[PDB]
Design a binder for this molecule. Structure first.
Ligand SMILES: *[C@H](CS(=O)(=O)Cc1ccccc1)[C@H](CCc1ccccc1)NC(=O)[C@H](Cc1ccccc1)NC(=O)OCc1ccccc1
Length: 215
């Protein structure tokens, strides 16, 4: 595979968002992945709605948690494959409470046909990402609260509890690393991003990788 890939360089990644006091990381991970896949399918980069999932995805638990795979399936099976634009369904869960789901007054910004679950292997995940784009992954974010920058070479890897987005990697660096987009504002980490060492399953990054498919 290529030595280094950074999808931000191809204009495929939207700006870092803010989940606030809501445990909606799974929604940001899922939507972030859809935003990138949609752009890669030949459409203009569009900000999509995490609120749609937090409020309407009943197979998940809003601010109490959820699974990116459940989110992908809900979109296809329950929402006719539709994903609203963020402007038409703004995020309003920053306080920790998800307002009721509204089935109208929104605009469809993207559509997906399904999703694939990637192998629990970093080399294989990197190969897929290099050609197909950003991947939604689950990680153990225990060590992430004190992250200020640089490549994290040691990460607590015990229990998956956070959903994020893999936007790239660099195998030619001193210590190969993954480039990850987080949803805790640009004030956290490296302008909202975090780089973790690649190759030793840091933060359990290879355990639950997946991506939406936009036919
Ligand atoms: C987002 C995490 S966060 O808020 O950014 C950081 C954090 C970690 C742990 C505890 C608090 C904050 C989600 C937080 C959920 C939550 C909220 C309040 C208390 C406890 C937990 N994390 C999730 O949503 C995780 C992400 C994940 C995705 C895939 C695989 C493993 C983890 N998912 C989760 O908890 O799902 C539970 C569930 C809910 C509904 C249906 C099935 C499973």
């Amino acid at each position: 595979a290529p030595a280094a890939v950074d999808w931000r360089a191809r204009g495929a990644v939207t700006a870092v968002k803010d989940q606030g006091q809501c445990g909606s990381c799974w929604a940001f991970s899922a939507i972030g992945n859809v935003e990138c896949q949609w752009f890669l399918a030949g459409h203009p980069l569009t900000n999509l709605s995490e609120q749609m999932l937090v409020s309407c995805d009943k197979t998940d638990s809003g601010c109490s948690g959820g699974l990116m795979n459940n989110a992908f399936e809900w979109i296809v099976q329950e929402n006719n494959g539709a994903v609203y634009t963020e402007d038409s369904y703004p995020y309003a869960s920053g306080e920790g409470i998800s307002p009721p789901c509204t089935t109208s007054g929104h605009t469809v910004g993207a559509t997906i046909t399904g999703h694939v679950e990637l192998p629990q292997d970093e080399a294989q995940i990197a190969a897929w990402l290099a050609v197909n784009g950003p991947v939604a992954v689950a990680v153990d974010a225990s060590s992430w609260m004190t992250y200020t920058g640089g490549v994290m070479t040691s990460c607590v890897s015990e229990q998956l509890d956070h959903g994020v987005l893999l936007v790239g990697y660099n195998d030619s660096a001193a210590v190969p690393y993954w480039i990850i987009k987080n949803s805790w504002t640009t004030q956290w980490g490296e302008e909202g991003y975090i780089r973790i060492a690649k190759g030793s399953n840091q933060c359990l990054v290879k355990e639950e990788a997946s991506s939406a498919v936009v036919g």
